[PDB]
Amino acid sequence: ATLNQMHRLGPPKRPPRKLGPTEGRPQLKGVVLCTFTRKPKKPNSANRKCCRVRLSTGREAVCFIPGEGHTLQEHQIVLVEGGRTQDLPGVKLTVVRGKYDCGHVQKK
Amino acid sequence: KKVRPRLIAELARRVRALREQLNRPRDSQLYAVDYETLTRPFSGRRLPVRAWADVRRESRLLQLLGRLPLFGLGRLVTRKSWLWQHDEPCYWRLTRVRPDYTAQNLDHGKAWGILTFKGKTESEAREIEHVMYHDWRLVPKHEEEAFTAFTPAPEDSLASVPYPPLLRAMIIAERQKNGDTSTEEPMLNVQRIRMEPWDYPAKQEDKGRAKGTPV
Amino acid sequence: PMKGRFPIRRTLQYLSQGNVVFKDSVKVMTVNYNTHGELGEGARKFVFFNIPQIQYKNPWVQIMMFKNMTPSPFLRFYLDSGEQVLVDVETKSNKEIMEHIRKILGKNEETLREEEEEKKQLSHPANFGPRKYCLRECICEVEGQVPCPSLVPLPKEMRGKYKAALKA
Amino acid sequence: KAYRGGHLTIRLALGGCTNRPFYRIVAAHNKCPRDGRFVEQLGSYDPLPNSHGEKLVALNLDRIRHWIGCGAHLSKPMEKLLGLAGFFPLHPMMITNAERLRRKRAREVLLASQKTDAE
Amino acid sequence: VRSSVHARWIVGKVIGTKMQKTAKVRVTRLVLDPYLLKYFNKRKTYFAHDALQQCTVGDIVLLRALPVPRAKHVKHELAEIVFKVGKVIDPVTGKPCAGTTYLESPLSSE
Amino acid sequence: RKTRHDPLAKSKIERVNMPPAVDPAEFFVLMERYQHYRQTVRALRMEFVSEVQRKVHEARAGVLAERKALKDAAEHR
RNA sequence: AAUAGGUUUGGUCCUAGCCUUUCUAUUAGCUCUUAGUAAGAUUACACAUGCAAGCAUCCCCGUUCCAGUGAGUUCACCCUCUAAAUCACCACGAUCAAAAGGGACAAGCAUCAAGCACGCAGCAAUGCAGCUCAAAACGCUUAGCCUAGCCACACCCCCACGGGAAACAGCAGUGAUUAACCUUUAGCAAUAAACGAAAGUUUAACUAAGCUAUACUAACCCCAGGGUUGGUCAAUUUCGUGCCAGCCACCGCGGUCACAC
RNA sequence: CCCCACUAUGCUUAGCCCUAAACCUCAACAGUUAAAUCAACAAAACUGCUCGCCAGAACACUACGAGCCACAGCUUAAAACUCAAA
Numbered sequence A: 001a002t003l004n005q006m007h008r009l010g011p012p013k014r015p016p017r018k019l020g021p022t023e024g025r026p027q028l029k030g031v032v033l034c035t036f037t038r039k040p041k042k043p044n045s046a047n048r049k050c051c052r053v054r055l056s057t058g059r060e061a062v063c064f065i066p067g068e069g070h071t072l073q074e075h076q077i078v079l080v081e082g083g084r085t086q087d088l089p090g091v092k093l094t095v096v097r098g099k100y101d102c103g104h105v106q107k108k
Numbered sequence B: 001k002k003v004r005p006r007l008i009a010e011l012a013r014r015v016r017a018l019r020e021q022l023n024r025p026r027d028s029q030l031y032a033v034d035y036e037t038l039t040r041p042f043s044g045r046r047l048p049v050r051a052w053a054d055v056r057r058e059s060r061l062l063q064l065l066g067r068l069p070l071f072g073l074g075r076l077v078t079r080k081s082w083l084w085q086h087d088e089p090c091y092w093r094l095t096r097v098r099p100d101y102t103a104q105n106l107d108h109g110k111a112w113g114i115l116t117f118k119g120k121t122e123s124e125a126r127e128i129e130h131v132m133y134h135d136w137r138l139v140p141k142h143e144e145e146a147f148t149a150f151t152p153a154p155e156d157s158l159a160s161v162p163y164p165p166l167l168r169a170m171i172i173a174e175r176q177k178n179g180d181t182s183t184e185e186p187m188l189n190v191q192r193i194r195m196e197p198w199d200y201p202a203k204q205e206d207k208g209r210a211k212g213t214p215v
Numbered sequence C: 001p002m003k004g005r006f007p008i009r010r011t012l013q014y015l016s017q018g019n020v021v022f023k024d025s026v027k028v029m030t031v032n033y034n035t036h037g038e039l040g041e042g043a044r045k046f047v048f049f050n051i052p053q054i055q056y057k058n059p060w061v062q063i064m065m066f067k068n069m070t071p072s073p074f075l076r077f078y079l080d081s082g083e084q085v086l087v088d089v090e091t092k093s094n095k096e097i098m099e100h101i102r103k104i105l106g107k108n109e110e111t112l113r114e115e116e117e118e119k120k121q122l123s124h125p126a127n128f129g130p131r132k133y134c135l136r137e138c139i140c141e142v143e144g145q146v147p148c149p150s151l152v153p154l155p156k157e158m159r160g161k162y163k164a165a166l167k168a
Numbered sequence D: 001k002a003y004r005g006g007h008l009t010i011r012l013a014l015g016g017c018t019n020r021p022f023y024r025i026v027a028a029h030n031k032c033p034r035d036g037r038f039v040e041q042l043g044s045y046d047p048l049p050n051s052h053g054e055k056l057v058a059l060n061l062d063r064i065r066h067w068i069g070c071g072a073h074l075s076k077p078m079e080k081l082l083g084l085a086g087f088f089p090l091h092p093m094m095i096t097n098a099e100r101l102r103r104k105r106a107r108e109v110l111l112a113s114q115k116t117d118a119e
Numbered sequence E: 001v002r003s004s005v006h007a008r009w010i011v012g013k014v015i016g017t018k019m020q021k022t023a024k025v026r027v028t029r030l031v032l033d034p035y036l037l038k039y040f041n042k043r044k045t046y047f048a049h050d051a052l053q054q055c056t057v058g059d060i061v062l063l064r065a066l067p068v069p070r071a072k073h074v075k076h077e078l079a080e081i082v083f084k085v086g087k088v089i090d091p092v093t094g095k096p097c098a099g100t101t102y103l104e105s106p107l108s109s110e
Numbered sequence F: 001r002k003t004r005h006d007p008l009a010k011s012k013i014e015r016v017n018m019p020p021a022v023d024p025a026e027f028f029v030l031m032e033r034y035q036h037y038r039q040t041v042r043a044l045r046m047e048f049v050s051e052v053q054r055k056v057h058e059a060r061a062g063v064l065a066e067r068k069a070l071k072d073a074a075e076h077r
Numbered sequence G: 001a002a003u004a005g006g007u008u009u010g011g012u013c014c015u016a017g018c019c020u021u022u023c024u025a026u027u028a029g030c031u032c033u034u035a036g037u038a039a040g041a042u043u044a045c046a047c048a049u050g051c052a053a054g055c056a057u058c059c060c061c062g063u064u065c066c067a068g069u070g071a072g073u074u075c076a077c078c079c080u081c082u083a084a085a086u087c088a089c090c091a092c093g094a095u096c097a098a099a100a101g102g103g104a105c106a107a108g109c110a111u112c113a114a115g116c117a118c119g120c121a122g123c124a125a126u127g128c129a130g131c132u133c134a135a136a137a138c139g140c141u142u143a144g145c146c147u148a149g150c151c152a153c154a155c156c157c158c159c160a161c162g163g164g165a166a167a168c169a170g171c172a173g174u175g176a177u178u179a180a181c182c183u184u185u186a187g188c189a190a191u192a193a194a195c196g197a198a199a200g201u202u203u204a205a206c207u208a209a210g211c212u213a214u215a216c217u218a219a220c221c222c223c224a225g226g227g228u229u230g231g232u233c234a235a236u237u238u239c240g241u242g243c244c245a246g247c248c249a250c251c252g253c254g255g256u257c258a259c260a261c
Numbered sequence H: 001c002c003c004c005a006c007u008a009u010g011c012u013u014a015g016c017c018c019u020a021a022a023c024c025u026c027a028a029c030a031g032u033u034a035a036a037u038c039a040a041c042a043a044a045a046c047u048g049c050u051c052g053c054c055a056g057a058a059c060a061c062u063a064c065g066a067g068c069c070a071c072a073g074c075u076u077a078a079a080a081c082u083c084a085a086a
C-alpha cells in the first residue's frame, strides 16, 4: 500500500482474542451429570473415559478424565482445566485429578 | 460533550437554602443551656469543663440589657474574663441592640458597640462577639468615671531584633560579595508587627452560625 | 525498504536537524511555489526537504502551501502583531532560503541555549523520587547512610518489634 | 482535585521502609495525603545517623523563602528544623522541652546522691 | 490584545457564504503521522465575521481572533483577503496575474 | 475517618475531656516566648513576601527587562 | 515477531497457518527450614458486633479532609477570564484554584451513513435557511486513566426537594458467591490532619506488630522436592501390557524386542 | 449421450433485469534495459507515482442487516462449531 493509504487505514487491528472453553479462566467448578466413553478418531483406537459436567457458568460440556481408572459418579463435584484431548473431537476440558471428589490415580 | 443538565440538583439546592432561612433556629434555641447537666438541648453537646463555673455564676449580655431602658444603649459593659486578665479598663459602649423577641425573658440577641480594650478605644462601632457567653457585667452609672479612668503608659517597646544566626550570615556574605564593606548589623524591624492579645474581640460580622438541626 | 524517494526525510533524526526555530511572533507561514520552471527549483526542494523540519521545530505555527497561483515563488509570514513579512525566493536554493528565514525570524543560538538551561532547573539532582523524575528514590541509596532493610537487616535495637518487647 | 479552602504548607512527607524512616520536605496543599501529591520538593531529612554520626538535612533555602513569601504555612517539626539550622529562631517548645529535661535530670542526680549518701 | 480565543491568526480557504455576514473558512494544518513520520493536512472549519459580505467561495483569507466570540461558532473576523479567487495580485511585483502568467507585464511601470 | 453522618460511638457518650494542669511559672514564661517568637517570624515572613513581590515586578517592568524588550524590538525592525 | 526451531508432499521449491524455545502474573496438583523486606476478597452482592472526629471558657472551627472502591466514563491537560481560600489586618500584588469561554483528549464496529434543528444576522421586532457528516457526523459495544498521581463514584432512582428503602466500595470481621479466602492486634512515641493563644487533646490516617512461598534479599551442622528422559529439547535400565490400558505443546506412540503407556 | 417432432427462447418495438473463466486471470500514468537477470511455471527483469484490493483453510457467490422496477433475484457480507493444514 502507499503511504497515503497506510495513513488513511491506520495501524492494524488484532482480531479480538477468542475465549476458550474455560472462558479465559484457569479452572472451573463443575457437577458431574453422567460418565461414558468416547472413541478417538483414526488412526487411534481406545475407549477414552469422559464425563458431562454442568460448569459453574451454567454451561454443560464434555470433559476427559485422565489416568488409569476413576470413581466419578453423578452429582459429584470436580474441577476442570483447559487443554484439548488431541484425538477426541470436541473434548476441550480435562478433569483435575486430586481435587474435590476426583481423587489421585491409584498407584499401579 | 454538552453535559446533560441536572435539574433535581438545582431544585434541591434552592429548596434547602429556602428552608434554612424560613426554619432557621433562633438565639433562644441555639444558645440555651441546661444548668444541671451543662449541655445545650439544641444539639445535646456538653460545654467545655473550663466554662462550667462561669455558666452557673455569670450572666449573658442580653440578660443584663433586657432589664434596662432601650436595652441599655449608651451603657458600658465589661466581661469577667477581662476583669481577671487585665488591669486596664476593657469594655464595650453599646450603640445598637437587636433582642431575640422569641425568648421568654428577652435574654438573647445581638449587640453593637464601640470597643475600648486595655484603655485604647476604637474609631468605629461594630458587632460584639460572645454575646451568648455567661461572662458579662454592667458598669454602674456612678462608677463609670472611676472605671474608665486610664492613663496611657509609655509604649517603650523594642524596635528591632537581630536576624537568626544563619540568615544573618547569609545577608552579610551577600554584602561582601557585592563589594559592600559596611559593618552595620542586619536587623529585623518589628515596629510594624503589632501583637494583639489572643483575647482581643474578633470580628463578629465574619463569624459563622450553627445550622438548623434541633435535637 | 522504506517507501518513497528520500526516505531519510521520514526519520526522527532528520526532522530534528532543522535549525529554524521561529520567534514567538510568527503565527502563520504560507508557501507559494510553482511545480515547473527552473527558477522555482529551490522553492520546490524547500517544500520537499525543509518544510517538514520547520514544522517539526514549530508545531504550533500554521504552514499552508499554494501551487501555481503566481508567476514566481515567495514566502509570507504573518506575525502576532499583524505585520506581514514577504520573502522572495525565486532563483535561491533551498539552503539559502533556510538561512534567510533563520536570520530574519529565527531564534539565535544564544536564546536557544538559555531556554535549555532553564529546563535543567526542573530536575534538581538533590530531590528524591521515582526514577521518572529523580536520580535516586531513597536516601538509603547514598553510601554511608543506613541501607534499606530489604537488603541489609537492621540491628535488633533499631527495630520496633524488639523495642516494644523490651519496653513491654 | 480542588479542595474547599485550604492552603499550602511546608511539611515532612514520610518515606523509606519499616524501621527505616526518611523524610522529604515538600510544599503541598494541607488537605492532600501525607505522602501524595505535592507542589515542590524543598529538601530532605534523614533522621538516622549515618556512618559519620550525622543527621543529614537538605534545605532549598531559595525556594523555601519563595513559598513562605507566597503564603505557605510551616508544620511544627519543620519549624524546629529551621530553628536548629539557624534559619528561624529556636521554637518556644525546643527551649521549654530543654528546660524540662534539665529539671528532670536535676532530680535524678539528686535522687542518686541521696541514695549513695544513705549507703 | 488579549483574547479568550485559541487560534489568533489563521489562513484558510472560503468554502461557504450562505450565512449572513459570515464566511465559512476551511483551515488546514500539517500534522505529523507518528508511525509514518510523514506530515498530512488536517482541516478544520471556522466561521468568520464578514461585515461587508466581500468573501467569495474559493478565495484565501486571513482570519483574526475576536476578543470574545460573537456567536456560538463565530470566533473570528475577516482581517484580509489574501488571494481573491481568479483575481490574484502578485505580491512580489504588485501586478495582476492569471496562474503562473502575468496579465500586466512588470515592465509596464518599469 | 468518620463523616458527619456517622453516629457517635456509644462507649464515648459520657466522656468528659478534662483539661491539663497548669504550672503558673512555666505557663507565663512559655506564653511570653510564643509572643516574641511569633513577632520575629512575622517580621521574617514580611521580608520574604516583599522579596517575592520585588522579583515579580523586576521580571515584568525591570530595567533589564525593559532594556531587553527594546533591544529585541530594535533588532526586529 | 528472534540468531531461530518443529509440522503440509511419494519427493522438491514457494507461500502459509498452528505450535516450540524466552519473560511475567493468577489459579490448581505435589512439596516446603530460617531471617529481613515488599505485596496481599473473585464479586458496586448482603452484612452480626466493636471501633474509625473531635477540639474548645460557651461562639465558632472541623467532621466537605484522610481512608475506600472501579460501577459509570473523553469534567483530568493548555490558554483566557475570574470567585472562594492562604499571605495577622489592606495587599489593586503573589500563591493556589472553581464556575464560565476557547483549544486538545480511549478502543472496536461503516452490516451504525446520514443526523433531524443540530445555524447565522439584528439593540429589539424579526429576518435569512442554514448547521454536522466517508478527513467518519449520528449511533452501538468495550474499558477507570496519560500512575510523584489523576478522574469518577459514595445503597438505588445520572441528580436527591421527593421516593424506594434502612445502606462496612473506613478498619477488623462474617454470610453468600468465585479457580481466587490476611488479625474481630497495639499505640498516638514519629510524621500528617482537626482544634486550641498555649501547655496540649483526638485520629482503624499512620506507626509498630499478626497471618500467607505471591515476589525480592540473605542464610542454614542436620534437613529436597517437583517435573522431565521418541524428535523439536538436556536426560532410561529391566519388566508388565499387546491399537487394550493409557500417553503428547506440535509431529506422533500402543496390533508380543514399546528408549513414547 | 444417438434419431425425430415441437414449444419458451434467439429477431423487431417499448420497458426492465445488471450477471460471466465480463480473464489478454497481468490496475492507470511516467520511465529504464544497467546493475543482483530471475524461487517454479507462465507472457524477461525493474523504477517513480497514484487509486483499488489482500492477510491459514473451510464454514461462505452463505446468515443477518441495508439498498434495488429486481420477490426462487442482484449488490454489500459476517460469526459460532471444525481442522493442522489448505
Ligand code: FES
Residues within 6 Å of the ligand: C138, C139, C140, C141, C147, C148, C149, C150, D016, D017, D020
Ligand atoms: S527504599 Fe530506602 S529504606 Fe527502603
Ligand SMILES: [K+]
Residues within 6 Å of the ligand: A043, A044, A045, G243
Ligand atoms: K495409533
Ligand SMILES: [K+]
Residues within 6 Å of the ligand: none
Ligand atoms: K512454518
Ligand SMILES: [K+]
Residues within 6 Å of the ligand: G055, G056, G061, G195
Ligand atoms: K474549635
Ligand SMILES: [K+]
Residues within 6 Å of the ligand: none
Ligand atoms: K481516595
Ligand SMILES: [K+]
Residues within 6 Å of the ligand: G070, G144
Ligand atoms: K471503572
Ligand SMILES: [K+]
Residues within 6 Å of the ligand: none
Ligand atoms: K451514582
Ligand SMILES: [K+]
Residues within 6 Å of the ligand: G188
Ligand atoms: K501522633
Ligand SMILES: [K+]
Residues within 6 Å of the ligand: none
Ligand atoms: K465479476
Ligand SMILES: [K+]
Residues within 6 Å of the ligand: H021, H023
Ligand atoms: K481467459
Ligand SMILES: [Mg+2]
Residues within 6 Å of the ligand: A086
Ligand atoms: Mg497431535
Ligand SMILES: [Mg+2]
Residues within 6 Å of the ligand: none
Ligand atoms: Mg509423510
Ligand SMILES: [Mg+2]
Residues within 6 Å of the ligand: none
Ligand atoms: Mg469489574
Ligand SMILES: [Mg+2]
Residues within 6 Å of the ligand: none
Ligand atoms: Mg479573592
Ligand SMILES: [Mg+2]
Residues within 6 Å of the ligand: none
Ligand atoms: Mg474549570
Ligand SMILES: [Mg+2]
Residues within 6 Å of the ligand: none
Ligand atoms: Mg467504505
